[PDB]
Design an enzyme around this catalytic site. Structure first.
Site, mmCIF file in Angstrom:
data_model
loop_
_atom_site.group_PDB
_atom_site.id
_atom_site.type_symbol
_atom_site.label_atom_id
_atom_site.label_comp_id
_atom_site.label_asym_id
_atom_site.label_seq_id
_atom_site.Cartn_x
_atom_site.Cartn_y
_atom_site.Cartn_z
ATOM 1 N N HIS F 37 40.913 45.725 39.269
ATOM 2 C CA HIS F 37 40.519 46.405 37.789
ATOM 3 C C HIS F 37 38.922 44.896 37.509
ATOM 4 O O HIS F 37 38.024 45.701 37.898
ATOM 5 C CB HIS F 37 40.712 47.524 36.951
ATOM 6 N N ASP F 65 48.131 47.695 41.682
ATOM 7 C CA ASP F 65 47.273 47.259 41.158
ATOM 8 C C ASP F 65 46.744 45.530 41.166
ATOM 9 O O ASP F 65 45.987 45.277 40.287
ATOM 10 C CB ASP F 65 46.464 48.018 39.507
ATOM 11 N N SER F 127 42.827 40.833 31.124
ATOM 12 C CA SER F 127 43.217 41.482 32.576
ATOM 13 C C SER F 127 42.984 40.664 33.917
ATOM 14 O O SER F 127 42.183 39.755 33.772
ATOM 15 C CB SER F 127 42.448 42.965 32.891
#
Ligand SMILES: [Cl-]
Ligand SMILES: [Cl-]
Ligand SMILES: [Cl-]
Ligand SMILES: [Cl-]
Ligand SMILES: [Cl-]
Ligand SMILES: [Cl-]
Ligand SMILES: [Cl-]
Ligand SMILES: [Cl-]
Ligand SMILES: [Cl-]
Ligand SMILES: [Cl-]
Ligand SMILES: [Cl-]
Ligand SMILES: [Cl-]
Ligand SMILES: [Cl-]
Ligand SMILES: [Cl-]
Ligand SMILES: [Cl-]
Ligand SMILES: [Cl-]
Ligand SMILES: [Cl-]
Ligand SMILES: [Cl-]
Ligand SMILES: [Cl-]
Ligand SMILES: [Cl-]
Ligand SMILES: [Cl-]
Ligand SMILES: [Cl-]
Ligand SMILES: [Cl-]
Ligand SMILES: [Cl-]
Ligand SMILES: [Cl-]
Ligand SMILES: [Cl-]
Ligand SMILES: [Cl-]
Ligand SMILES: [Cl-]
EC number: 3.4.21.-
Lengths: 162, 162, 162, 162, 162, 162
Positions: F37, F65, F127
């Site tokens: 992401h 992911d 992240s």
């Protein structure tokens, strides 16, 4: 009979840029060291290292043809050169940026007063290049060449400060 | 823009001596690697490392113009070269013994089949010299020059054995 | 309880050869250090390292039974020993060459004046062997045994020069 | 002629303790390796390292006289031994704990099928001690001595798992 | 802009335990260094490192709020912190144990005299934690927090002894 | 019961910059690895390392992911991370850039299928940060935080290519 030298550190090199031209610089302590004539009358110089340009302030210009530049706070070099405690001037390793390229060579060298003479592998610009002993400690700063014969000025710890 | 290359290991170099002349060799695995013409028709060659001469035996001569020599059991090199997993042939570091001197230089390079071409700093004897990537992994073995343009044969792990 | 010691460096060892016999030497600074009786009244000695023999000149013989030899210019040791800043004499690591073999052992030790005493596993000649602390820094130079008890002379930075 | 060996790692050693007695062990990968008879029929053993005792579980007892113990999760060794790629059994470095003391020595060696035999400096037991090549890679696991002759079982990467 | 700092050494950390509570210590030279209030009036403290507890004797209590503890002879740390020659106080790396866990964070700092101010990432007990420069050399000893603002006492080589 | 972890390499971190926002990346092999992401639908992202911004191309987006970015040819990181062979998920080291700061912390971790949960030291975005074992090998890629609870997806060697 070959020159099998040690602790050769090309990561201790940078490129100095001024309006007048370019030279080689090298990290030692908190300084960037080069030939006086690379810096000239400039108070600030551009420093290139690993593809990033920095602005750096000239710290000290002694009587010797050497210049001391304060290493920028955000420039974190992967290697630095130390000076020799027991200097053997009989053989050397010279490291330089010459145009786009790294050029490293060993040579036997001869002393004349404060000056060192040795063979070089290019006639192009080597000004400021560190001239190291067989153990990679810096003995001198490359000044000039006449054909393939190089000339440097000997550096010692007392040159760093007035 | 400058070629700021890494893991340059001159301690991985040796000199190969035969009655026909001298060349550069380099340590990789348990071998000393050089160019076929450096070895010539000598099953046994002399190897010089850190000032000591060793007798060593040629192990394998593949179709490529490269020679593999068994490293003498009493020769303990301080560095060895590994081959590249993901080879970038766009730029190189070439390390050679030229007469008594180490000569190391970077260059942009080009691939023409199994041949790598790159600028060299001497026209002199660089035969056998490892041609490395920007991370100091061997890509090729230096073969010849036309002026200041060098040419090498690309090496891969399958070349080591029949 | 076991002596779990650190920074043991066999690469800092060499063999000293004279007309009267052999002994152990060790690299420290620009010197090879040994016991005085290994050198005797010889002005020049032979030094053996990684298979090559060198001729070396005795530099300095202080009041202590230690000898300092100038490391030959062409001999580039892979390791050197440093002296201890805050010496713990309660235990030691001794490294030596005995005939063809490297021998390393730990032991409890006791200091008294300028002598360090410790058990030796062997009565073989270890004259000149470095006696190090638990961190691999040299404390003393091994002199003699009687018979299973070793005796070494403590070494100091002031001992290197008059 | 001397055995000038390399990458000697005493920090890769530990001491194994059972009701039946004590032995040497060594860290390799995620394991502690020792001789099968140091463990015996015990499912759990005591491991002593840098002054701290741990409980550890026996992982695997193959047909060879070698034992594999899972290294305790909280025991973070400072060194581990790797196995030999191109194994030279002609000479060795043997590292062991003998009572309170580290003992390291080199020797010439010879292969007899699965067994390696070599001179030892002590007639004291060194059960489980690693027998390394000149480069510090583990060749074999010490089993027994008869007088000043030690005997070891050669180890494979294949011996680690069934 | 990011704080890309270097030579961060968690192995140079330990935990100090007293009847009054716990704090962070760090290894430097032959000492363990912490904040004076971590030690208090105690002459002996408990030291935890890599899972083993030690009793350690307080050595020297200078006028500064810094405590010097003699490192136990059997406690051999994997890392030690050095002091900076030419201290740059503008940015720091703080390393501490908070409860069971390591916490490392960077910050910009203000010098002021004998005290140093910076942001911290926790409000918890960081007492005695080393405050390092961008190169991992100790500049100061963490004292207290007022919110997410830390304060430290600058350390100097002259602080080690009276 | 403190977590004393090893081989923490903040030099293996970079920052990923996109129109949508920023994340942490890490060097492994010839790749920069991050959370999917962070990259999103971008074919090209910006990479910040040691004060210099580079343009980089997204190599591979697996079903997991996680995102793989080809390291720019002129970006030469000082450290890279390797994956673990014998993964211990009991405890972790998390390394990230959080705004301008480096943050490093250890924590006990909890496994749920292919996912990992652990305490983090900030509520701000991390992240893409590497989640490492006690030895500094990467186990997982940090996805998001909810409060001071971090969540990561476990990585294995097969994820690198389809
Ligand atoms: Cl030679
Ligand atoms: Cl030389
Ligand atoms: Cl430039
Ligand atoms: Cl010379
Ligand atoms: Cl540049
Ligand atoms: Cl480049
Ligand atoms: Cl020769
Ligand atoms: Cl390139
Ligand atoms: Cl023990
Ligand atoms: Cl000990
Ligand atoms: Cl060594
Ligand atoms: Cl000899
Ligand atoms: Cl002791
Ligand atoms: Cl010898
Ligand atoms: Cl040998
Ligand atoms: Cl070790
Ligand atoms: Cl025990
Ligand atoms: Cl042999
Ligand atoms: Cl940045
Ligand atoms: Cl910074
Ligand atoms: Cl550390
Ligand atoms: Cl504790
Ligand atoms: Cl700063
Ligand atoms: Cl603890
Ligand atoms: Cl832990
Ligand atoms: Cl790093
Ligand atoms: Cl940026
Ligand atoms: Cl754990």
């Amino acid at each position: 009979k070959h020159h099998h030298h040690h602790h050769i550190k090309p990561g201790a090199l940078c490129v100095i840029d001024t309006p007048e031209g370019k030279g080689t610089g090298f990290f030692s302590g908190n300084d960037i060291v080069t030939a006086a004539h690379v810096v000239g009358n400039n108070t600030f110089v551009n420093v290139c290292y690993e593809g990033l340009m920095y602005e750096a302030k000239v710290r000290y210009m002694p009587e010797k043809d050497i210049a001391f530049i304060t290493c920028p706070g955000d420039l974190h070099p992967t290697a630095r050169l130390k000076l020799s405690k027991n200097p053997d001037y009989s053989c050397v390793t010279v490291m330089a940026y010459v145009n786009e390229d790294l050029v490293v060579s060993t040579a036997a060298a001869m002393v004349y007063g404060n000056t060192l003479s040795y063979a070089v592998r290019t006639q192009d610009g080597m000004s400021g290049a560190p001239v190291c002993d067989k153990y990679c400690r810096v003995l001198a700063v490359h000044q000039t060449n006449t054909g393939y014969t190089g000339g440097a000025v000997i550096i010692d710890p007392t040159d760093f400060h007035p």
